[PDB]
Design a protein around this ligand. Sequence first.
Ligand SMILES: [Mg+2]
Ligand SMILES: [Mg+2]
Ligand SMILES: [Mg+2]
Ligand SMILES: [Mg+2]
Ligand SMILES: [Mg+2]
Ligand SMILES: [Mg+2]
Ligand SMILES: [Mg+2]
Ligand SMILES: [Mg+2]
Ligand SMILES: [Mg+2]
Ligand SMILES: [Mg+2]
Ligand SMILES: [Mg+2]
Ligand SMILES: [Mg+2]
Ligand SMILES: [Mg+2]
Ligand SMILES: [Mg+2]
Ligand SMILES: [Mg+2]
Ligand SMILES: [Mg+2]
Ligand SMILES: [Mg+2]
Ligand SMILES: [Mg+2]
Ligand SMILES: [Mg+2]
Ligand SMILES: [Mg+2]
Ligand SMILES: [Mg+2]
Ligand SMILES: [Mg+2]
Ligand SMILES: [Mg+2]
Ligand SMILES: [Mg+2]
Ligand SMILES: [Mg+2]
Ligand SMILES: [Mg+2]
Ligand SMILES: [Mg+2]
Ligand SMILES: [Mg+2]
Ligand SMILES: [Mg+2]
Ligand SMILES: [Mg+2]
Ligand SMILES: [Mg+2]
Ligand SMILES: [Mg+2]
Ligand SMILES: [Mg+2]
Ligand SMILES: [Mg+2]
Ligand SMILES: [Mg+2]
Ligand SMILES: [Mg+2]
Ligand SMILES: [Mg+2]
Ligand SMILES: [Mg+2]
Ligand SMILES: [Mg+2]
Ligand SMILES: [Mg+2]
Ligand SMILES: [Mg+2]
Ligand SMILES: [Mg+2]
Ligand SMILES: [Mg+2]
Ligand SMILES: [Mg+2]
Ligand SMILES: [Mg+2]
Ligand SMILES: [Mg+2]
Ligand SMILES: [Mg+2]
Ligand SMILES: [Mg+2]
Ligand SMILES: [Mg+2]
Ligand SMILES: [Mg+2]
Ligand SMILES: [Mg+2]
Lengths: 49, 106, 127, 197, 172
Amino acid sequence: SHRKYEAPRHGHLGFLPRKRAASIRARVKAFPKDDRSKPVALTSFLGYK
Amino acid sequence: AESHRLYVKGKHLSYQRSKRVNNPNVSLIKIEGVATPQDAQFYLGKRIAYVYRASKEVRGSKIRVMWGKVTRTHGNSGVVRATFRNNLPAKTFGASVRIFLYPSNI
Amino acid sequence: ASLPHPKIVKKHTKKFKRHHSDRYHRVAENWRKQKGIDSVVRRRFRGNISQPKIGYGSNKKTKFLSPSGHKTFLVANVKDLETLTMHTKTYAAEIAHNISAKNRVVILARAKALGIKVTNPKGRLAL
Amino acid sequence: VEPVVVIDGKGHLVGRLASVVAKQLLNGQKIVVVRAEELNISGEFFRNKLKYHDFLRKATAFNKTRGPFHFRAPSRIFYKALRGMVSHKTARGKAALERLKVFEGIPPPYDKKKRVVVPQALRVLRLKPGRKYTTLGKLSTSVGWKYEDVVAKLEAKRKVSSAEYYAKKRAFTKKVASANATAAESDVAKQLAALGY
Amino acid sequence: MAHFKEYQVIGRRLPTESVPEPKLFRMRIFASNEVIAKSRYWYFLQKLHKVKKASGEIVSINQINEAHPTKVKNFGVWVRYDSRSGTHNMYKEIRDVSRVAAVETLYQDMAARHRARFRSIHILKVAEIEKTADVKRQYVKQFLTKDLKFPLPHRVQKSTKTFSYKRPSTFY
RNA sequence: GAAAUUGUUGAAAGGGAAGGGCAUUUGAUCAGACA
RNA sequence: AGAACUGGCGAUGCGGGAUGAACCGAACGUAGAGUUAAGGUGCCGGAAUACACGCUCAUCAGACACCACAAAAGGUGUUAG
RNA sequence: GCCCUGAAAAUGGAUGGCGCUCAAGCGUGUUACCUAUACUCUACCGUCAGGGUUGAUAUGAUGCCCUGACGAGUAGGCAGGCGUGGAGGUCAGUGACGAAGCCUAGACCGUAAGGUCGGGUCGAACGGCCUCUAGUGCAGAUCUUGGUGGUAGUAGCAAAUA
RNA sequence: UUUGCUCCACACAAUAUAGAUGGAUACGAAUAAGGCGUCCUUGUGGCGUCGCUGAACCAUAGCAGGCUAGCAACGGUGCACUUGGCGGAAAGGCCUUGGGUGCUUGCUGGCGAAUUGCAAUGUCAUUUUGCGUGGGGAUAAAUCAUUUGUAUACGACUUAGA
Ligand SMILES: [Mg+2]
Ligand SMILES: [Mg+2]
Ligand SMILES: [Mg+2]
Ligand SMILES: [Mg+2]
Ligand SMILES: [Mg+2]
Ligand SMILES: [Mg+2]
Ligand SMILES: [Mg+2]
Ligand SMILES: [Mg+2]
Ligand SMILES: [Mg+2]
Ligand SMILES: [Mg+2]
Ligand SMILES: [Mg+2]
Ligand SMILES: [Mg+2]
Ligand SMILES: [Mg+2]
Ligand SMILES: [Mg+2]
Ligand SMILES: [Mg+2]
Ligand SMILES: [Mg+2]
Ligand SMILES: [Mg+2]
Ligand SMILES: [Mg+2]
Ligand SMILES: [Mg+2]
Ligand SMILES: [Mg+2]
Ligand SMILES: [Mg+2]
Ligand SMILES: [Mg+2]
Ligand SMILES: [Mg+2]
Ligand SMILES: [Mg+2]
Ligand SMILES: [Mg+2]
Ligand SMILES: [Mg+2]
Ligand SMILES: [Mg+2]
Ligand SMILES: [Mg+2]
Ligand SMILES: [Mg+2]
Ligand SMILES: [Mg+2]
Ligand SMILES: [Mg+2]
Ligand SMILES: [Mg+2]
Ligand SMILES: [Mg+2]
Ligand SMILES: [Mg+2]
Ligand SMILES: [Mg+2]
Ligand SMILES: [Mg+2]
Ligand SMILES: [Mg+2]
Ligand SMILES: [Mg+2]
Ligand SMILES: [Mg+2]
Ligand SMILES: [Mg+2]
Ligand SMILES: [Mg+2]
Ligand SMILES: [Mg+2]
Ligand SMILES: [Mg+2]
Ligand SMILES: [Mg+2]
Ligand SMILES: [Mg+2]
Ligand SMILES: [Mg+2]
Ligand SMILES: [Mg+2]
Ligand SMILES: [Mg+2]
Ligand SMILES: [Mg+2]
Ligand SMILES: [Mg+2]
Ligand SMILES: [Mg+2]
């Protein structure tokens, strides 16, 4: 009929589905842009918290 | 030679039909190289074989045939209507079909 | 060796089953006419089962003929069988379902003697 | 007429190309279509962009995952024009569609195979001069297609190899003509002229 | 209404004892056949005279053929017609090779530009324009200039097979 | 010693029901008629 | 909501109008061959991506009776008068 | 005239859909072509009608034979038939060498109601024809009585200290 | 778990098939412009020529294509080898060398074909699998149970164990 009072929805539709991940090791979906003028180097690193 | 063909290549298009009722009794045939009813008048009467295979041998063969005849032309673009000894199975819309040169009148 | 006859044409070999006799066990296939006010079958909408009607009736000429072209005549004994003595091109004996095996071999023998066809000779046959 | 027909989409008008492609499959002719990125649609770019956004808003309100799917690639905009011209929920229809393949660019097999065109859907033959029109690849990038650049790069590479090929060939048929002409005027050739050859 | 013939039609009101030999009137009429032609005749006589078909008679009906059917002529054409909201007189000019051809393209034109079906039109006059320069409408004047020539750019040939192995050329 | 309903065996079909109509392919099955 | 005359639906399937009681065509025994209606013939879909003269370009074009809506007013868009 | 403005509503979305721009749009013209249980011709069914035919020595006179037209249908009327329990007659009917009943994507006759056969199971009785008779035909009635499912190996089997 | 797996070869058996029956025959780009030839001052160049459809081009004769001889060419092509190189968009294919070998209808010869009876697809393709045989080749893992708690309603997850 129309809310009554307006309020923001709860939580963020851009983090759905709220399922368990396919792996403990989260994936790197993107790497820094490449600049082939600099020396060769890793662009990330593993460790344990 | 490499070619031994004595028939014209053809194609089982459709049953005769209206917008929502077909008629398994009359098939519509597209003949290669025939683009008009005047052309298709040549083939009226010619005999037509749909040739197919089966797993189970019969009187010697694993190859069976359904025989028919072209009967009239159909529309303006060379398509032809044909009837068969038994109506064609309808999985064959789009299947190849053989149109012979007999009965000949040349 | 039956009388010559025009090719037998059957018009509707498919059985007329009652509507919805395929939908509920409580409904036998025996033909039964819809009388409902709304029924699609009674109203003959395109796509439902057709119904028996007099158009389907067979040629007076080949009606009742079996494939052999003989009418079948039910027979209980040699006397019944012998009613077909003068009509072996026209009628064929069927031996009735409740005739004993030993009486069948008599009936069958006499049929052979008279040239009368028998539609079910192998019945109860001591093989 | 041939087992498989390869159509150079470039310069064809979507729905007229689709209309013929659909019929062919239904009739049993396998079709493969290349360079769908160089397809056209009549109507200026903005128009067809607006149309595409209309399409884009239709979705299943309770779950957009079940709702109409919006493919952004020129090959697949194309398939869509096509698929909707085919009774595609019937066996006969699935069968026709399996007979079809569509590509952006000209990937292997088909780059060394001849491609044809379909004059009754050729833009330059159909559209009245001056009427604006759209190119499929440019429409697609604007609604998300990610691969115009990569296709462009491969195509330029492919187009260089094919220029070589052509050149070699044209060199060769020049020789062949030089041959065919010593034989001109010979007796067997005058006889063939006599018979229309 | 079709492919037109042009007819002379002649009628009169029926004779009477006190008035035998009534006057006799003629119309030229453009129609596809003599049945429509006699119909049209009665239609116009009744807009002009105390008569109708039940008290009149067709005296003669004859097709008039063009005198010089392979001679290009400049036609002046005068029409009355109804629109959706009124009725209107019009002058047009048509260049063709017969009155009959000329009137076909008129109905075509009237249907295309003004959306006038056949019922809504009255041809008032069709006349050959003898001197160029009494030619008034420029879409024709245009075709009277000396030593006139023009190309037909962007040639489009009809394909006869659905596939083609070239890539056409609109040269000409 | 029926039916509903059930177990096993055998055969078949099954991309959001099933079942039905006209037609034919394919499999299985079967009457008749030849002399 | 209520009358008039006829024709229909109700009691009626069939072809068309995608769909639909009433509109269009046409009224039904079982079948073969033929030809049509109303309606269609790019593809879906049987059937000319037929012929012919114009008109129309829409950053919410338009697309067929019943029928699934649009008006006053206004345009130096374009057309013919 | 066509187009444009004027032109605002609620899930995403409909010239039927795809899509179409010298159209696959709008107005008009000309051919061809597709297809209704309709029209034309033919066979077969039935209905109504009009004819013909008692002459024995063979078989249906309610018969046989020729001919023409016609066929939609609720409520409803009438007609000719199918099936069930009992009754009179008849077939000197069937049957322990297997009656009745039951089973059977085996056969055959009938437009259909239904009828007939084979095979399996079974165990004592039963059927054709003329006729008599009625407690004589089911899908329904929130029908009656009995039986049985999916629900489902599911809800649950957790108060009172162990 | 009674000798298993894999690639190549041939063999028998199956099973199939959305539909072989001479060839899918490769620039790009423009369309109010281009292709090809040719020259040159190498250019938005000169000159010539073509289109008006693939109605083309290529292939195509021989028991469905048998057995044989020769000549002229030195060409063509099938096959298995071998040399050098290319192609990653889905390359999985293209090109090149060299010897061998078959066919050659480029031409000229010898022999064969019937009775499949006046037609009957008259059977010539390519799918997947199964079983033995013998030429190479190769000799694991996953799951239950146990265990961790970075995980968990149950499955699942994540650890650990010769
Ligand atoms: Mg609010
Ligand atoms: Mg998972
Ligand atoms: Mg309908
Ligand atoms: Mg009932
Ligand atoms: Mg009702
Ligand atoms: Mg929105
Ligand atoms: Mg017991
Ligand atoms: Mg069935
Ligand atoms: Mg069937
Ligand atoms: Mg009522
Ligand atoms: Mg009606
Ligand atoms: Mg569709
Ligand atoms: Mg069609
Ligand atoms: Mg109106
Ligand atoms: Mg509508
Ligand atoms: Mg204006
Ligand atoms: Mg619309
Ligand atoms: Mg449409
Ligand atoms: Mg029009
Ligand atoms: Mg035509
Ligand atoms: Mg009929
Ligand atoms: Mg009749
Ligand atoms: Mg009736
Ligand atoms: Mg009775
Ligand atoms: Mg009784
Ligand atoms: Mg009683
Ligand atoms: Mg018994
Ligand atoms: Mg059963
Ligand atoms: Mg029998
Ligand atoms: Mg028994
Ligand atoms: Mg006892
Ligand atoms: Mg009685
Ligand atoms: Mg009672
Ligand atoms: Mg009942
Ligand atoms: Mg009951
Ligand atoms: Mg009930
Ligand atoms: Mg009832
Ligand atoms: Mg009950
Ligand atoms: Mg109960
Ligand atoms: Mg339990
Ligand atoms: Mg529980
Ligand atoms: Mg509790
Ligand atoms: Mg298949
Ligand atoms: Mg040039
Ligand atoms: Mg050059
Ligand atoms: Mg030059
Ligand atoms: Mg060529
Ligand atoms: Mg050879
Ligand atoms: Mg020889
Ligand atoms: Mg590929
Ligand atoms: Mg081995």
